């Protein structure tokens, strides 16, 4: 079958989530009873979905995430296997369970409304990451969660990199998606930093451009800051000071926006990993994300 | 001859408790999440059981995890499983229930999985001598009319003390159920049905629908914070006020609770007036608690 | 549709996961041998009884403890395949389904069982109290937790005091493992099965001796049955007359796992059909003999 | 260049512990039962990890539940997973192991599930600069010869102090494994292979087979309760007696424990005599313990 060659995979570190998805014909009225058009299970979590898209795009990838044995684990693991995502670095846990997101998708508009049920699964630790043999990966993408622990991980990778020739340097990306103050440290790590519109608004920014000019001072020297802003497309700012923008590329009809953000992030990583410019990565990300929005789930993108 | 039979649906309720109703396109954290056996007739068995009346659930099931959960839960409440009917296609339906803990509202996204209904032919095999009361949740009305006629015919051969009392619930607003009004000693009509039919109060609905019941029958309409009313053959409109709890936290199955409490009270020989008061009392208590257990 | 009254045979007892290794020769201690094959098969005396009953065409139900999980999904899936009624499964919040590691020697068809208990709570008398008896014409109880099973047997007897003859429930008990608490069960049921292993453990050299020596312990009117593998089986009832059937050996004996369950279930079937004790004995030997020439159970029919 | 790589099999050991060895056709109750990650190279990493030596497992796995257990366990011992090779056909082999707690004996019913082996093409991708020692469990000899030739060629460009040390285990009496004797710094031959070659002691086996090893190589043969012997280039036969525990409860993986401990000792720069003694000491200790953890 083949040993995985050095420096050949993209690693994504973060959460797996079970999405239990109900499609409805209009957004439910409070205290009413509505009939589901359909209902399905779908693997989710930001880093988990990134691997789906990377895979679909034809990038070898690996997922590192906590896991608990069980029926839900069986489903998300089996799904991860379907997309040939390398799972050697799954971290099994003896307490807690995989979280469940109950997702209401309104077919009127493609909107998605998420009721998140946390089930106490322990996060991947810095001492878990210490065990990872870095020779396997050309790019490591980290979904911000437990900051002080992830900082140690990012520090580990930077230290590896001080010992590597240019062909063997590991590119790093970070996602700051949840509006929690402890994630603010993460801006100062990584070659590419993704900040969400949600965090941007919570941090007092009115636009993507304002967010990027406002937060660029927090990134490490040389970093590219990326902020996606839904129907207003996506922007980026790198060390040259030039604000880059892509318009959104909506499909003719929006039916399912769940994981559109992850589709953007993964598409930007793919494009950059393939040696495209940041400008090109931005447009590709918005194009792939918009195509996804016209489809149920992820498969029809390729 | 001492059991109460409840014929209807069983539903898996997958319940999420939230601090406010979710805005569309937002992500909110659940305070908690639980599985709960539901369905109208199924919930009625739960309350009867808690009140101390031996009961049996008659309804369709399918093999698998969901049915195993609901069967186990039925067992925990000592609900007699003799008349469960295992179907070879379809699956137990699943209600995703959002309970807003700000108000106790329950919003239900219902996912049907094509489970066949129990038929008149299934009902023909039921041993009617086991039951003092049979309650039918309106579902497949042409078949259920045949069940009701079976009970009626049975009752023509019984002395007074051996007569099986019958209640019917019309709880979904589907016209095919109108037929069912014409059977039973007690007929329950839901506020939701009443409102869909154009009615704006319990008394308005009772006066608007009493034409449809058979001679001697009592029509009953519960109206949430407005208590419950009843109208019987003497023409006297009866009412109980509600019994709201200190805070309403969970109104899922409150109407089932009311119906079961009324059946319990009536099956025990109480007046329709006392039956309304007790249904209002128990259902109001239920609304102040998660699930059903704390009612007793 | 709805199961008619008095129509099913209920079997109360254990479900077990059998993990079966087929080997060309019985392994020598401290050696390493290659498995010819390896399979998962649902087992447990009461569980296996239902398989045979379903195969013979008798509507049946299984009541035993179950713990959610993978092993449960395997045995539950397999129970459903034979259309066994599962409404009286007693799911438990502790413990797991036991695993029996079984070595089958292809040279002889012997079965050696390494049994691993996984602390699953047993079906209790309170559990049994909830069973609506109107569904069943025959109840078979695999002896396990005897003081609780005696209450179940007492409940069935009381039920029967209120039934016309068409509605009387017939009862069998199995004493298969040589454990002291079980021997109390000899005194209940219309039909009492005692294994060759138990007989030998109590110091009896033959099916005849075991039946003479144990008959004083059964209740008035009962039939005591003791199968003796390749020597056939015996039965003894109130008339003091020992009945026998010789074994019906297969061309080659390839798998004897569940032969005893096959026997028991086929006797129950034949009796439940109104056959004589002599005929049920014969038929039990006939079906268990056939099973011994086949891997698993499906080939009996 | 500080890790030890162990190339060979992982096997799932499904272990039943009993108080007596089973009589054929009987039924016996297990004292206990457990899964243990096994296989010669896999066990080697467990021991190296416990002794304090950073190591890596190279070997085939198939995605699925069993691999998840194996990877988790490897994770727990901090064994580097980089050179695990995922196969798209076959599955991890399963060894059903009966351990008689009265003697500590282990009887193995092996179920092979057709897992493709690690190839020399896989080995070509290994970063040799990561490792100071490489241990190869003899299996697919023509492929492993190519691996050993690759290591030899790498060593021709290293100075004395950056040379990769190499061990080979010949554990099966298969004629194809004999060519592996000519490779490596340390060659392990089991008591079983030795007896099959007609040797009646470790001393006879060493004398009889030393001619098959390359110039300067050390040949080692463990003889269980009789200890272990070695022979190197000076021609001096070395021996250590066994170190039996108070009682022998579990001898599964005792050969792997010996080999790994010898490798460890030698990797730390100890004499061959000291390494023999240490391997006997650790292996002896293991045999008095269920599994591996209690050795340190």
Numbering used by the authors:
A (entry chain C): -3 to 298
B (entry chain B), D (entry chain A): 3 to 298
C (entry chain D): -2 to 298
Task: Please quote the paper that reports this structure.
In this study, we determined the crystal structure of KHK-A, one of two human isozymes of KHK, in the apo-state at 1.85 Å resolution, and we investigated the roles of residues in the fructose-binding pocket by mutational analysis. The final structure contained two homodimers in the asymmetric unit. The central α/β domain comprises a nine-stranded β-sheet flanked on each side by five α-helices, resembling the conserved Rossman-like fold. A four-stranded β-sheet extends from the central α/β fold to form the lid domain. The protruding β-sheets of the lid domain of each monomer interact with each other to form the dimer interface of KHK-A. The two monomers are related by a two-fold axis of rotational symmetry, forming an isologous interface. The protruding β-sheets of each monomer are packed and oriented orthogonally to each other. Additionally, a central bend in strand β3 wraps around and interacts with strand β7 of the other monomer. For example, S28, I30, and C32 of strand β3a stabilize the dimer interface by forming backbone–backbone hydrogen bonding interactions with residues I110 and Y112 of strand β7 of the other monomer.
Fructolysis is not robustly regulated and is initiated by ketohexokinase (KHK). KHK catalyzes the phosphorylation of the C1 hydroxyl of fructose to generate fructose-1-phosphate (F-1P). Alternative splicing results in the production of two human KHK isozymes: KHK-A and KHK-C. In most cells, the expression of these isozymes is mutually exclusive.
